Amino acid sequence: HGVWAPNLHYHTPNPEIPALQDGRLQVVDRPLPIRGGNVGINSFGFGGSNVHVILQPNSRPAPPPAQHAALPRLLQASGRTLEAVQTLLEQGLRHSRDLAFVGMLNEIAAVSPVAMPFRGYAVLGGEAGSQEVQQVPGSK
Amino acid sequence: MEEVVIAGMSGKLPESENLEEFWANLIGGVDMVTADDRRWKAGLYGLPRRMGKLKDLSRFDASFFGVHSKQANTMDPQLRMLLEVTYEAIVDGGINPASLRGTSTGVWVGVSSSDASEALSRDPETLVGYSMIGCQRAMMANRLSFFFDFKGPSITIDTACSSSLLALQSAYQAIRGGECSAAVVGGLNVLLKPNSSLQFMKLGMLSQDGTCRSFDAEGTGYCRAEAVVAVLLTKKSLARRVYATILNAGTNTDGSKEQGVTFPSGDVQEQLIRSLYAPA
Amino acid sequence: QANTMDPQLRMLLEVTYEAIVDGGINPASLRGTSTGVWVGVSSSDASEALSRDPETLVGYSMIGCQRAMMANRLSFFFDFKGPSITIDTACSSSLLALQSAYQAIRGGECSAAVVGGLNVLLKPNSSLQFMKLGMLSQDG
Amino acid sequence: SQAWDVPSAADFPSGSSCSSVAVYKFDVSPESPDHYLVDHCIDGRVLFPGTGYLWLTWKTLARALSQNLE
Amino acid sequence: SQAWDVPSAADFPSGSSCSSVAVYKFDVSPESPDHYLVDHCIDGRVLFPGTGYLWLTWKTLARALSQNLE
């Protein structure tokens, strides 16, 4: 979301460590937009076992193709109830033109109705607004 | 040799069932710690009225995971909602779980408190012997490996508070060097027996205030909270989605401090932070 | 603080001394090392025992029972500043600890390690569960 | 849909050897093995057999005794 | 030389919850917090205060009550 979670309960910087207003460190008490990501993380078990880990966010925006141009995509889904599916299709519709997202949804949907006995589909884009949800006969 | 990325994530956290709830609370700056008769009572034995508690804890989709209705009521709820989040996590990263069935994929779990286990082992002639296939710590991973068919390393680590992060370190390392193509990194903590907190409070590490005053001068202690969380690591040449890339990670261990065992050695923590930066 | 120590940990602290000096090394030579500790432990019975009577039982029993301490407190006394870790995998564990350390040494990380395995049979309920799964031999 | 057994804080002990207290739960729906009880109807109500309390208690005794009823 | 506390057979749960039975163990060696009891000497023996049983019992009550003595 390009923003750092506003830490809570921050009021009086601990008067036992500087850098809490000595410029060096900056407690995030406000929602700060993020710029040049690259993060560390701490975890110290009370028994004296420490571990750190460095991260590098991926930075990469979405191109402008010519396929979802006039081409409606097919979005399909599976779940454990009518809702489980009605939920997914709701998220697919609200993110119509986003191809990265729809593709993934699809790669997932492919689960045997032996486990996910509930399926549905939607026609993203195109004057269809064609959307059907059904239960699914077991067996092959 | 190979590049390691965070492809999937999910969890259930204090006053949040899914990660979109969790976020609305992080942004909305909402205190997820509460004052409830939820795990135990108003303020039993003087324990602080505040705890970070999971909304529900009894929920679980037992048929889908293939567990006899009986053999499920004798399952540690951590494991219950682990089996769910780590599914919710794999599919989070655009991968159909089944694609991994039979893989050299592995499972690392950070778990320190198996409370449910003791609870269902008292009754000496009320006691169902297969509760242990559903509570014995090893199962926090062994049974996650079981259902997803991950034929790679299945392991639980305990290092107190560290653990889950060190699990995430341990897996990254396994992938990095051949062994695996992906991993399930999980962390679990559920607060069921009050005696536990009671020990903590007697060591003073428990905040009566019932809060984690993060850097504010009035830091008494911390405020225990629960969560099941899991992430999917994988090699980039296999991730349909990448939240971030792991650049490094390692752990050491506060030597022998003169000031006791509980004392966080910042001089050692300092070392650990260097080992992973500047020259190396 | 000793009567509230899990006897595993008690006799671990002794064997792993008895072990280091077994190999002609004076333990102290390792003080401050990047040496590490891996423990295969599945059953911390003593831990629950001293955690019931909430007026009787004291708060620092957990510095002497909490699984993490099976290694964290072995690391503590010997001054091993390298990885301190407990693993649980049921019966496997201790061997897999010995695997895990070998690997850490192999590739830089450490110059030496303490591999430990611990199992003490205190609560009968445990065995009772096993028997009900049939894996216990009546023949004994 | 279905909600499952979450070991409550109550479950855990304040300490005990407790072999001398027993709670018995009685289901009278036609499926229950203790459906036979519905035949102790009196004046139109199904009242637990005064005799039953003796049985319960008696059972309870042998429990604490590591023995069986017989 | 010195032998230490080995959690015993009968130390872990052995029936089910009972907010209604309590065992109290009393050590009178000079280290114990309950050493104060050695001052209830009578005729040359150290006899547990008749009054003590009342205290024990009283404690026990409040336990079962989820409450504290006060």
TrEMBL record, chain C:
Chain's role: Fatty acid synthetase is a multifunctional enzyme that catalyzes the de novo biosynthesis of long-chain saturated fatty acids starting from acetyl-CoA and malonyl-CoA in the presence of NADPH. This multifunctional protein contains 7 catalytic activities and a site for the binding of the prosthetic group 4'-phosphopantetheine of the acyl carrier protein ([ACP]) domain.
First and last residues shown, out of full length: 71 to 210 of 2512
Entry protein name: Fatty acid synthase
Taxonomic superkingdom: Eukaryota
